[PDB]
From Swiss-Prot, chain A:
This is Mediator of RNA polymerase II transcription subunit 24. The chain holds residues 249 to 371 of 989 of the full protein. Ubiquitous. Abundant in skeletal muscle, heart and placenta. Component of the Mediator complex, which is composed of MED1, MED4, MED6, MED7, MED8, MED9, MED10, MED11, MED12, MED13, MED13L, MED14, MED15, MED16, MED17, MED18, MED19, MED20, MED21, MED22, MED23, MED24, MED25, MED26, MED27, MED29, MED30, MED31, CCNC, CDK8 and CDC2L6/CDK11. The MED12, MED13, CCNC and CDK8 subunits form a distinct module termed the CDK8 module. Mediator containing the CDK8 module is less active than Mediator lacking this module in supporting transcriptional activation. Belongs to the Mediator complex subunit 24 family. Component of the Mediator complex, a coactivator involved in the regulated transcription of nearly all RNA polymerase II-dependent genes. Mediator functions as a bridge to convey information from gene-specific regulatory proteins to the basal RNA polymerase II transcription machinery. Mediator is recruited to promoters by direct interactions with regulatory proteins and serves as a scaffold for the assembly of a functional preinitiation complex with RNA polymerase II and the general transcription factors. It is found in: Nucleus. A motif (LXXLL motif 2) lies at residues 92-96. Transmembrane segments: none annotated.
From Swiss-Prot, chain B:
The chain holds residues 14 to 231 of 747 of the full protein. Disulfide bonds: none annotated. Component of the Mediator complex, a coactivator involved in the regulated transcription of nearly all RNA polymerase II-dependent genes. Mediator functions as a bridge to convey information from gene-specific regulatory proteins to the basal RNA polymerase II transcription machinery. Mediator is recruited to promoters by direct interactions with regulatory proteins and serves as a scaffold for the assembly of a functional preinitiation complex with RNA polymerase II and the general transcription factors. Required for RARA/RXRA-mediated transcription. Transmembrane segments: none annotated. Component of the Mediator complex, which is composed of MED1, MED4, MED6, MED7, MED8, MED9, MED10, MED11, MED12, MED13, MED13L, MED14, MED15, MED16, MED17, MED18, MED19, MED20, MED21, MED22, MED23, MED24, MED25, MED26, MED27, MED29, MED30, MED31, CCNC, CDK8 and CDC2L6/CDK11. The MED12, MED13, CCNC and CDK8 subunits form a distinct module termed the CDK8 module. Mediator containing the CDK8 module is less active than Mediator lacking this module in supporting transcriptional activation. It is found in: Nucleus. It comes from the Eukaryota. Residues 1-205 are annotated as: Interaction with the Mediator complex. Belongs to the Mediator complex subunit 25 family. This is Mediator of RNA polymerase II transcription subunit 25. Ubiquitously expressed. Highest levels in brain, heart, kidney, peripheral leukocytes, placenta, skeletal muscle and spleen.
From Swiss-Prot, chain C:
The keyword Signal does not apply. The chain holds residues 392 to 1334 of 1368 of the full protein. It comes from the Eukaryota. This is Mediator of RNA polymerase II transcription subunit 23. GO terms for cellular component: core mediator complex; mediator complex; nucleoplasm; nucleus; transcription regulator complex.
Length: 119, 210, 943
């Protein structure tokens, strides 16, 4: 949520380095890790003010975060863990419905097709 | 009746031991005469009409970088005035006999000017000034005052005597200079001393005869 | 009191005088307040005068000078609020107070001027008819009001002790009624009214003052604390026991006042009030009048139905109701009708199935009537006639005798009025009772036709032309009978025809509702319109028409008592409520209720509590009105639309109800959507949150039936929900889906107030509305998220923490139904909570199989063992056994538990706090069947 709010324009490698650091400090399982990434992205999209910030948050969740996950996969059985995290997330229907009301469309469909495109 | 009471006290080692006696015999009854009946904790400040008391305490020149006069703001409570009279500490003095009466009188004059700009509901009131001193004046003209700088005690007490300010002197030791100043402050156109040693001359105010 | 001075110095920094405001506002009395404080400090400083004298400040000298000049003026009138300022400032003066005090009292007492006549004969009251206005009494202080109260009380005591026939002033009793509203003069007010004033008025045997005070309490009292109401009911019963009440005007007043207090006992005051009079049950019951006892039993029925007192039990024994009902069985053998008995609670039905007293046959009554008829036509000596037909203890058939007399002779001889005058008021209602049975038997046996209209005309002339019986008394004695089947249909047909065939009641009702208004606190010309009515339709109470139409016309000149408020239309109203309940109880007479509410429906403008009446009616007759949606619609629209003139737009029903459900049915009932229910619950959360526009207009809660705005919002919301044509399960599910389903208009970060309002609303509704929460819990217990998928297997003690809703991680109906279940059960009465053990051991226990469901049931029920251990201890034990049984099923049907430690600590906490050792024998069978680790931690349970 900090990288979304302050530096959208930062490079993904610094963010991947920081996230791998945090995963090594407190020993975080991969499904809970990717779940916290998606939950943070969606919560920050819902709480965004209307205007440019909402466009910036949609870009961060839709484009930057999928690229960050790809770099984590190279650095690290990632597909099973991200699929587990997606089922973890799909239990949370009120978050996804609040997001869908702000997205004016089902945003989880676009997420799943985008993560399919990235592999 | 409405009264603008200003006390001018010499806060030095002389008047140190004698002050408690003077307060019971003369100062405390004088406050009661202005405020009928003794004060106790119900009197409230802030009535701009009415009697308003004030203190000016002065010093000698040995408090060398400190200021010479400590003035207090006007109060309508006689009780706050009594606590102020308790709160004086007499610590000054040294190798001298005189004190800065000109400073205390000049700030008393500035008090009476600010009083005169304050009360406009009444044109003129009972404007009473007391001087509780134990010492002859210095020969310095007044230095730490604006609009009354460079004035001796005689000129200032002339300006007190004209314009209708009732000037009084309470002294525990009988002195010539104080008597001369009292004679000079004559308003334009009774033995009150309980103790023979005390010299008390009151132009204005009523104190029980002893 | 001296610390007020520094506060005044803080709030008032000024240099000059503060100007005097305009006196023609009441709020200008708030502008003078600190000067009245200063006067009150000066007058206390007058004691030890020079010691701490308090001078007026320089800012307050102008207002003090204004008060000095206005006291110095002696030409003082009530046109402005200068009189109020003078009373407020100088209420703490001995002789400076009397100069405004007499100035305002003499306008309302009215000495000297004239004597103005009250209706009837021989009534003359003191002159003044205009009372003090409300804003004047609201602009005095408390001490001025206490002095005015004590002055008026002493005046009424003196005029009581003067034994005078000059009645009390109308302005005086109107003003005293307006002053008993204030609960801050309480020890001088209603407490003194019932503890001191009324026993002395009874002691001096006034009957002039007593009738005024009972009239003022019946027609001008709104918010009375319930113990005063029960004390006054006891005093009315002791009064009706004594005082030789041949006065029909006094006995009618005390009987109608007790009827007005019984049926307006609130549904939750009954049990804590009547447990105080339990050892002395006779004090609060009538011993002679049966109808008040039947009204008390019906009030008991709807009180123990609305609060659900009897669930969690099925025996009436061991409860406070048994003593009351037993003491009503003596003094009043009376058997309830089946249609009426079918509506009661269970234990009341089991009580009234026994103690059934048999009754006389129809033919034996007919033979007895004919015996006394031939004895009247044969015997001729006048004093023997008068003594025989009014023998006390003889079967009362005298009104049936009169019926047969004016049926065919069409007149009455001189002697019957003498017999009636020797009977008195107390036995006369027994004569009305047997006359009612005789009426329904003869009307059943009569061929309907022109003979039927002859019978209805002679009954109408018995009511009005001869004035033998009052209409509400007759209709009450008809409606509270015990007849079955077609006889009950004939009785309610008699009531409908008697109200609707002549013009004699429709004229009085129409003329009263077109020319009056219920807001008596806003009116100053009440006595004028009262005299207009009582001129145009005089109410005769001591057999005046019979005294005229007797062939030697006997002139009676008996004195009438003071009547300021009372008339037949406002004496019919509680009887009309009972009658509407009787028409709902019986099936095939609903068209009579439709035409009654069409004609006499506007009379409910003057009902002191219409919305509580509708809430009690739809809540108690919900099983009957389930399939008659049109009748329920007609009832609520009549009772509400009677009031659409006085009270503001949108006071009761939502506008989207007013625009859709105010239509006729074309077999398309308006099925409401979720936006409707979100609007309703939004109105309740906005009244309870406090809102400056406010979804309701703001009223004067000193003069409503609801004490605060929240109770008003809740009752009109529940009336609107029960008045729909949609069944209970759909309304309850839609209320739950306000919060359970995802919804805009329901903000996150404000969800707990919405769950709070759903708890209050759906608890206050009948059984088929709040039973659906059990189905929702069952729907989430058998979910894939608790049973098969722990795909989100997050620590369940996070998952069932609802406050997780802080971050947007609320799971689903799991935590949402847990939160709404806690919000509903937190507001539930104990009779509604006591259906939880049946729901555990019958529904939930055959489906708890995994550990998450067991923890969900623990999270669901565990916080309410405090309520069970406090109030009803069977159910705590049954819940404890159910907990251990579910633990057994999950230990059997699972490989291992991950959370054996919180389960074990919960069970030890439940033992050491709530159950103790009542669960000993039945627990150890369960503990011994567990797996070894759980047994190793649970071994200390068995000691």
């Amino acid at each position: 949520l900090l990288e979304g709010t302050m530096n959208l324009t930062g490079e993904t490698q610094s963010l991947v380095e920081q996230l791998t650091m945090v995963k090594r400090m407190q020993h975080i399982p991969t499904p809970l890790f990717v779940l916290e990434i998606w939950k943070a992205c969606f919560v920050g999209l819902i709480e965004s003010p209307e205007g440019t910030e909402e466009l910036k948050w949609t870009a961060f969740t839709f484009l930057k975060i999928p690229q960050v996950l790809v770099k984590l996969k190279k650095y690290s059985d990632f597909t099973e863990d991200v699929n587990c995290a997606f089922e973890f997330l799909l239990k949370l229907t009120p978050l996804l419905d609040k997001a869908d009301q702000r997205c004016n469309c089902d945003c989880t469909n676009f997420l799943l097709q985008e993560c399919g495109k990235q592999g | 009746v409405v009264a603008d009471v200003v006390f001018v006290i010499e806060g030095t080692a002389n008047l140190g031991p004698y002050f408690e006696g003077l307060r019971k015999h003369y100062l405390l009854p004088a406050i009661e005469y202005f405020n009928g009946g003794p004060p106790a904790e119900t009197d409230f400040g802030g009535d701009y009409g009415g009697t308003q008391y004030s203190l000016v305490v002065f010093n000698t020149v040995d408090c060398a970088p400190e200021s010479y006069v400590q003035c207090h703001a006007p109060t309508s409570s006689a009780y706050e005035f009594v606590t102020w009279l308790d709160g004086i500490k007499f610590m000054g003095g040294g190798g001298e006999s005189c004190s800065l009466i000109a400073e205390g009188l000049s700030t008393a004059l500035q008090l009476f000017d600010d009083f005169k700009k304050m009360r406009e509901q009444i044109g003129q009131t009972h404007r009473v000034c007391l001087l509780i001193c134990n010492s002859p004046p210095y020969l310095l003209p007044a230095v730490e005052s604006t609009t009354y700088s460079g004035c001796t005690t005689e000129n200032l007490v002339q300006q007190i005597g004209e314009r209708g300010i009732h000037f009084s002197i309470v002294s525990p030791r009988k002195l010539p200079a104080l008597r001369l100043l009292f004679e000079k402050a004559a308003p334009p156109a009774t033995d009150v001393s309980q103790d023979p040693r005390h010299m008390v001359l009151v132009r204005g105010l009523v104190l029980p005869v002893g | 009191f001296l610390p007020v001075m520094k506060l005044f110095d803080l709030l008032y920094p000024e240099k000059e005088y503060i100007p005097v405001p305009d006196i023609n506002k009441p709020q200008s009395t708030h502008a003078f307040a600190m000067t009245c404080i200063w006067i009150h400090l000066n007058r206390k400083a007058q004691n030890d005068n020079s010691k701490l004298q308090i001078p007026i400040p320089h800012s307050l000298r102008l207002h003090h000078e204004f008060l000095q000049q206005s006291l110095r003026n002696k030409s003082l009138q009530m046109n402005d609020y200068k009189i109020a300022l003078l009373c407020n400032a100088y209420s703490t003066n001995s002789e400076c107070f009397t100069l405004p005090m007499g100035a305002l009292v003499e306008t309302i007492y009215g000495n000297g001027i004239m004597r103005i006549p009250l209706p009837g004969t021989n009534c003359m009251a003191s002159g003044s008819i205009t009372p003090l206005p409300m804003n004047l009494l609201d602009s005095l202080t408390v001490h001025a009001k206490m002095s005015l109260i004590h002055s008026i009380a002493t005046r009424v005591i003196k005029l009581a002790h003067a034994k005078s026939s000059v009645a009390l002033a109308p302005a005086l009793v109107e003003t005293y009624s307006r002053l008993l509203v204030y609960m801050e003069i309480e020890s001088l007010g209603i407490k003194g009214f019932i503890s001191q004033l009324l026993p002395t008025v009874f002691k001096s045997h006034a009957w002039g003052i007593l009738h005024t005070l009972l009239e003022m309490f019946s027609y001008r009292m709104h918010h009375i604390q319930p113990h005063y109401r029960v004390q006054l009911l006891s005093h009315l019963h002791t009064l009706a026991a004594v005082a030789q009440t041949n006065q029909n005007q006094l006995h009618l007043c005390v009987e109608s006042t007790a009827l007005r207090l019984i049926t307006a006992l609130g549904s939750s005051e009954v049990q804590p009030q009547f447990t105080r009079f339990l050892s002395d049950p006779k004090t609060v019951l009538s011993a002679e009048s049966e109808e008040l006892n039947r009204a008390l039993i019906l009030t008991l029925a709807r009180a123990t139905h609305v609060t659900d007192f009897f669930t969690g039990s099925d025996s009436i024994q061991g409860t406070w109701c048994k003593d009351i009902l037993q003491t009503i069985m003596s003094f009043t053998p009376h058997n309830w009708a089946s249609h009426t008995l079918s509506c009661f609670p269970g234990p009341l039905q089991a009580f009234f199935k026994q103690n059934n007293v048999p009754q006389e046959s129809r033919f034996n009554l007919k033979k007895n009537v004919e015996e006394e008829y031939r004895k009247w036509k044969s015997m001729s000596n006048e004093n023997d006639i008068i003594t025989h037909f009014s023998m006390q203890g003889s079967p009362p058939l005298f009104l049936c005798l009169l019926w047969k007399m004016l049926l065919e002779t069409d007149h009455i001889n001189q002697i019957g009025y003498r017999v009636l005058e020797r009977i008195g008021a107390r036995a006369l209602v027994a004569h009305v009772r047997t006359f009612a049975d005789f009426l329904v038997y003869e009307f059943s046996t009569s061929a309907g036709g022109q003979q039927l209209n002859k019978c209805i005309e002679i009954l109408n002339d018995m009511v009005w032309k001869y004035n033998i019986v009052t209409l509400d008394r007759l209709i009450l004695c008809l409606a509270m009978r015990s007849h079955e089947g077609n006889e009950a249909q004939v009785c309610y047909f008699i009531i409908q025809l008697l109200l609707l065939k002549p013009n004699d009641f429709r004229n009085r009702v129409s003329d009263f509702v077109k020319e009056n208004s219920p807001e008596h606190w806003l009116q100053n010309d009440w006595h004028t319109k009262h005299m207009n009515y009582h001129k145009k339709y005089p109410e005769k109470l001591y057999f005046e028409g019979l005294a005229e139409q007797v062939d030697p016309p006997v002139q009676i000149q008996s004195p009438y008592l003071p009547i300021y408020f009372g008339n037949v239309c406002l004496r019919f109203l509680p009887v009309f409520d009972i009658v509407i309940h009787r028409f709902l109880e019986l099936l095939p007479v609903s068209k009579s209720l439709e035409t009654l509410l069409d004609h006499l429906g506007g009379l409910y403008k003057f009902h002191d509590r219409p919305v509580t009446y509708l809430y009690n009616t739809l809540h108690y007759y919900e099983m009957h009105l389930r399939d008659r949606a049109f009748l329920k619609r007609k009832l609520v629209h009549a009772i509400i639309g009677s009031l659409k003139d006085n009270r503001p737009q949108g006071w009761c029903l939502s506008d989207t109800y007013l625009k859709c459900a105010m239509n006729a049915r074309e077999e398309n009932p308006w099925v409401p959507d979720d936006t409707y229910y979100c609007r309703l619950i939004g109105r309740l959360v906005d009244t309870m949150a406090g809102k400056s526009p406010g979804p309701f207009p703001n009223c004067d809660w000193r003069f409503n039936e609801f004490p605060n705005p929240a109770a008003h919002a809740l009752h009109v919301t529940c009336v609107e929900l029960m008045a729909l044509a949609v069944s209970g399960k759909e309304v309850g599910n839609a209320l739950l889906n306000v919060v359970l389903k995802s919804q805009p208009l329901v903000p996150r970060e404000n969800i707990t107030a919405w769950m709070n309002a759903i708890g209050l609303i759906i608890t206050a509704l009948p059984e088929p509305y709040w039973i659906v929460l059990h189905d929702r819990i069952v729907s989430v217990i058998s979910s894939p998220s608790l049973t098969s998928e722990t795909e989100w297997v997050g620590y369940p003690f996070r998952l069932f923490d609802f406050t997780a809703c802080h971050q947007s991680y609320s799971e689903m109906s799991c935590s949402y139904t847990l939160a709404l279940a806690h919000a509903v059960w937190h507001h539930s009465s104990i009779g509604q909570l006591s259906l939880i053990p049946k729901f555990l051991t019958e529904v939930l226990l055959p489906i708890v199989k995994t550990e998450f469901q067991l923890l969900y049931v623990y999270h669901l029920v565990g916080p309410f063992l405090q309520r069970f251990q406090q109030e009803r201890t069977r159910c705590m034990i049954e819940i404890g056994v159910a907990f251990y049984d579910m633990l057994l099923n999950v230990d059997q049907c699972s490989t291992h538990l991950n959370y054996m430690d919180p389960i074990c600590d919960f069970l030890y906490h439940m033992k050491y706090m709530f159950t103790g050792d009542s669960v000993k024998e039945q627990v150890e069978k369960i503990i011994c069947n567990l797996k070894p680790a759980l047994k190793l931690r649970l071994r200390f349970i068995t000691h």
